[PDB]
Design an enzyme around this catalytic site. Structure first.
Site, PDB file in Angstrom:
ATOM      1  CB  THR A 124      -0.781  -0.340   1.368  1.00 33.54           C
ATOM      2  OG1 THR A 124      -0.179   0.278   2.294  1.00 33.54           O
ATOM      3  CG2 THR A 124      -1.466  -1.562   1.031  1.00 33.54           C
ATOM      4  CB  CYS A 139      -6.204   1.897   7.368  1.00 29.27           C
ATOM      5  SG  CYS A 139      -4.796   1.655   7.230  1.00 29.27           S
ATOM      6  CG  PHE A 188      -6.090   5.682   4.897  1.00 27.52           C
ATOM      7  CD1 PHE A 188      -5.201   4.561   5.066  1.00 27.52           C
ATOM      8  CD2 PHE A 188      -6.782   7.231   4.858  1.00 27.52           C
ATOM      9  CE1 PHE A 188      -4.211   5.185   4.831  1.00 27.52           C
ATOM     10  CE2 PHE A 188      -5.244   7.327   4.689  1.00 27.52           C
ATOM     11  CZ  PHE A 188      -3.472   6.626   4.639  1.00 27.52           C
TER      12      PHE A 188
HETATM   13  C1  HEM Z   1      -1.581   4.299   2.180  1.00 29.17           C
HETATM   14  C2  HEM Z   1      -1.085   3.073   2.401  1.00 29.17           C
HETATM   15  C3  HEM Z   1      -2.629   2.667   3.398  1.00 29.17           C
HETATM   16  C4  HEM Z   1      -3.334   2.125   2.014  1.00 29.17           C
HETATM   17  C5  HEM Z   1      -4.548   2.728   1.518  1.00 29.17           C
HETATM   18  C6  HEM Z   1      -4.795   1.761   3.118  1.00 29.17           C
HETATM   19  C7  HEM Z   1      -5.917   1.120   2.926  1.00 29.17           C
HETATM   20  C8  HEM Z   1      -6.671   0.508   3.636  1.00 29.17           C
HETATM   21  C9  HEM Z   1      -8.185   0.381   3.548  1.00 29.17           C
HETATM   22  C10 HEM Z   1      -8.565   0.935   2.366  1.00 29.17           C
HETATM   23  C11 HEM Z   1      -8.526  -0.990   4.937  1.00 29.17           C
HETATM   24  C12 HEM Z   1     -10.003  -0.827   4.676  1.00 29.17           C
HETATM   25  C13 HEM Z   1      -9.985  -2.402   4.366  1.00 29.17           C
HETATM   26  C14 HEM Z   1     -11.253  -2.922   3.990  1.00 29.17           C
HETATM   27  O1  HEM Z   1     -12.453  -2.282   4.830  1.00 29.17           O
HETATM   28  O2  HEM Z   1     -11.610  -4.040   3.505  1.00 29.17           O
HETATM   29  C15 HEM Z   1      -7.507  -0.850   5.644  1.00 29.17           C
HETATM   30  C16 HEM Z   1      -7.342  -1.681   6.908  1.00 29.17           C
HETATM   31  C17 HEM Z   1      -6.569  -2.066   7.472  1.00 29.17           C
HETATM   32  N1  HEM Z   1      -5.243  -1.765   7.251  1.00 29.17           N
HETATM   33 FE1  HEM Z   1      -4.409  -0.490   6.049  1.00 29.17          FE
HETATM   34  N2  HEM Z   1      -3.776   1.678   4.465  1.00 29.17           N
HETATM   35  C18 HEM Z   1      -2.662   1.463   3.755  1.00 29.17           C
HETATM   36  C19 HEM Z   1      -1.403   1.243   4.706  1.00 29.17           C
HETATM   37  C20 HEM Z   1      -1.257   0.415   5.975  1.00 29.17           C
HETATM   38  C21 HEM Z   1      -0.975   0.561   6.932  1.00 29.17           C
HETATM   39  C22 HEM Z   1       1.591   1.054   6.976  1.00 29.17           C
HETATM   40  C23 HEM Z   1      -1.227  -0.440   7.502  1.00 29.17           C
HETATM   41  C24 HEM Z   1      -0.105  -1.997   9.264  1.00 29.17           C
HETATM   42  C25 HEM Z   1       1.139  -1.670   9.015  1.00 29.17           C
HETATM   43  C26 HEM Z   1      -2.050  -1.281   7.669  1.00 29.17           C
HETATM   44  C27 HEM Z   1      -3.152  -1.986   8.234  1.00 29.17           C
HETATM   45  C28 HEM Z   1      -4.067  -2.319   8.392  1.00 29.17           C
HETATM   46  C29 HEM Z   1      -5.040  -2.925   8.681  1.00 29.17           C
HETATM   47  C30 HEM Z   1      -5.021  -3.764  10.092  1.00 29.17           C
HETATM   48  C31 HEM Z   1      -6.300  -2.955   8.754  1.00 29.17           C
HETATM   49  C32 HEM Z   1      -7.397  -3.905   8.837  1.00 29.17           C
HETATM   50  C33 HEM Z   1      -8.018  -2.650  10.400  1.00 29.17           C
HETATM   51  C34 HEM Z   1      -9.571  -3.249  10.680  1.00 29.17           C
HETATM   52  O3  HEM Z   1     -10.510  -3.223  10.219  1.00 29.17           O
HETATM   53  O4  HEM Z   1      -9.537  -3.549  11.890  1.00 29.17           O
HETATM   54  N3  HEM Z   1      -2.289  -0.537   6.104  1.00 29.17           N
HETATM   55  N4  HEM Z   1      -6.430  -0.048   4.799  1.00 29.17           N
END
Ligand code: HEM
Ligand SMILES: CCCCCCCN1CCC[C@H]1C(=O)N[C@@H](Cc1ccccc1)C(=O)O
EC number: 1.14.14.1
Length: 454
Positions: free
Chosen positions: A267, A399, A392
């Site tokens: 990402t 996220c 996010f």
């Molecule tokens: C530009 C960077 C990033 C973008 C665009 C992004 C985007 C997203 C999005 C759209 C979701 C929601 C997914 C869903 O509803 O199915 C999400 C969930 C998540 N992201 Fe990211 N993410 C990024 C970076 C990261 C990083 C660096 C980490 C961890 C080191 C991370 C960990 C997570 C986790 C653990 C979730 C699940 C949260 C939950 O439902 O409790 N993400 N992310």
């Protein structure tokens, strides 16, 4: 009450063959341009509805009416990410438990603790580019992926992937990329039981074994040493959920570490790659961002407080997320029967897909210039309507890494703009590769050092 449009069908296979492409998200974006704010998509034994308008997505984002669904993509990633935060259902005990334990570790305050490790990897990237010869170019997504993987390895569990010391990835990364490839390829198969796919299934099982073996060894090695570092693994070994009173078990910790490595690899690297793409294509914006980096980053090592001052660099990153949200979709299900937008009756359990790149192109929100890269759109955050901008995701399932990703990307892009001038020496034509995420493929630039010491 209206009937939804639906794209072209293939007899018994319904719409499924529309996803038989290496660029299915881009294909769905073209369908959304043709059919509008909502369309039905059918596969054998499955129906979802693709949403593209802020008008409908604001209702989908009502957590009283809709909860996170695991898309088929997420169900296939769950075979190696298990009940980590990204691939767990909201109602699974380990979702709320891990959420409560990990939230403080991912807060803006927590970024002060990760900053020095992020600087370590960012300085490695700057030194790599300082050491290129005159005739050489940068492979942008390749170097951004080296950086973001290394940052989450060091901040996640004090492990150095040493990606800047390698041509060929660390073996863990070989297995993780091949597992993500198999998860995303499996979506398209009209006929997944064909013995042709037998080798794929054997390789996938070997790759899951490899990821579990390294991560289970990292956890066991840390519990044996007793070492207390400033990493997520220490937080997960020591942390207790206030609700249950329980800590995470070692299996769930392994799923969280795998989940974080997937996120860092896929990402933030895409975001940085798209940001640099838009900067070299928009030199007025590049100059504005470079002025800010030069004025703010007055020390050889950026501080936490200095990164927070990079307002325009943050606007550049938000405008890159607007046009190419690297995590391009998320899925919801209806908690109860409900009517979407006064027009589209849904039954309990009905699924929705949010097409984030199409949301971000809603002309009723952004105006007629939606395809133009203009970070000034973000100069006044309060001017962005609720649920117009969702790179996010949404609500409690948004996220957890958002502050981490934006701190890292702001620091890195700030240092890149401080230390180098950039040239689009090939007049690069944007080609977006789809894995779990979106990234420019083949994007190359030349740097010219401003000869500012570290
Ligand atoms: C530009 C960077 C990033 C973008 C665009 C992004 C985007 C997203 C999005 C759209 C979701 C929601 C997914 C869903 O509803 O199915 C999400 C969930 C998540 N992201 Fe990211 N993410 C990024 C970076 C990261 C990083 C660096 C980490 C961890 C080191 C991370 C960990 C997570 C986790 C653990 C979730 C699940 C949260 C939950 O439902 O409790 N993400 N992310
Ligand atoms: C972090 C980013 C995660 C992005 C995940 C989504 C990424 N998909 C990859 C292909 C496009 C996109 C999507 O719309 N998929 C649906 C596709 C689907 C719908 C109906 C029947 C069968 C399959 C799904 O996986 O259910």
């Amino acid at each position: 009450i209206k009937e939804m449009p639906q794209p072209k069908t293939f007899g018994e296979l319904k719409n499924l063959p529309l996803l038989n492409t290496d660029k299915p998200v881009q294909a769905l974006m073209k369908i959304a341009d043709e059919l509008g704010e909502i369309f039905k998509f059918e596969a054998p034994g499955r129906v979802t509805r693709y949403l593209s308008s802020q008008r409908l997505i604001k209702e989908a984002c009502d957590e009283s009416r809709f909860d996170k669904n695991l898309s088929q993509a997420l169900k296939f990633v769950r075979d190696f990410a298990g009940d980590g935060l990204f691939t767990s259902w909201t109602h699974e005990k380990n979702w709320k438990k891990a959420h409560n334990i990990l939230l403080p570790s991912f807060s803006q305050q927590a970024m002060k603790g990760y900053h020095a490790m992020m600087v370590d990897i960012a300085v490695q990237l700057v030194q790599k580019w300082e050491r290129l010869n005159a005739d050489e170019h940068i492979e942008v997504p390749e170097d951004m992926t080296r950086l973001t993987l290394d940052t989450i390895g060091l901040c996640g569990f004090n492990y150095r992937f040493n990606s800047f010391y390698r041509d060929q990835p660390h073996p863990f990364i070989t297995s993780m990329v091949r597992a993500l490839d198999e998860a995303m390829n499996k979506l398209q198969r009209a006929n997944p039981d064909d013995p042709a796919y037998d080798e794929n299934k054997r390789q996938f099982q070997e790759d899951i074994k490899v990821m579990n073996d390294l991560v289970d060894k990292i956890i066991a090695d840390r519990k044996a040493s007793g070492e207390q570092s400033d990493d997520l693994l220490t937080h997960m070994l020591n942390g207790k959920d206030p609700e249950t009173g329980e800590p995470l078990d070692d299996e769930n910790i392994r799923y969280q570490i795998i989940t974080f490595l997937i996120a860092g690899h896929e990402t933030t690297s895409g975001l940085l790659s798209f940001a640099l793409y838009f900067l070299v294509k928009n030199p007025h914006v590049l100059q504005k961002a470079a002025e800010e980096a030069a004025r703010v980053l007055v020390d050889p090592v950026p501080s936490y407080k200095q990164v927070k001052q990079l307002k325009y660099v943050g606007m550049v990153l938000n405008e890159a997320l607007r046009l190419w949200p690297t995590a391009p979709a998320f899925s919801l299900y209806a908690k109860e029967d409900t009517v979407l937008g006064g027009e589209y009756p849904l039954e309990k359990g009905d699924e929705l897909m949010v097409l984030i790149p199409q949301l971000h192109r809603d002309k009723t929100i952004w105006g007629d210039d939606v395809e133009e890269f203009r970070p000034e759109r973000f100069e006044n955050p309060s001017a962005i309507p609720q649920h117009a901008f969702k790179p996010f995701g949404n609500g409690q399932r948004a996220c957890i890494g958002q502050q981490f990703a934006l701190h890292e990307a702001t620091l890195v892009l700030g240092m890149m703009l401080k230390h180098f001038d950039f040239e689009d020496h090939t007049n690069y034509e944007l080609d977006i590769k789809e894995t779990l995420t979106l990234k420019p493929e083949g994007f190359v630039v030349k740097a010219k050092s401003k000869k500012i010491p570290l």
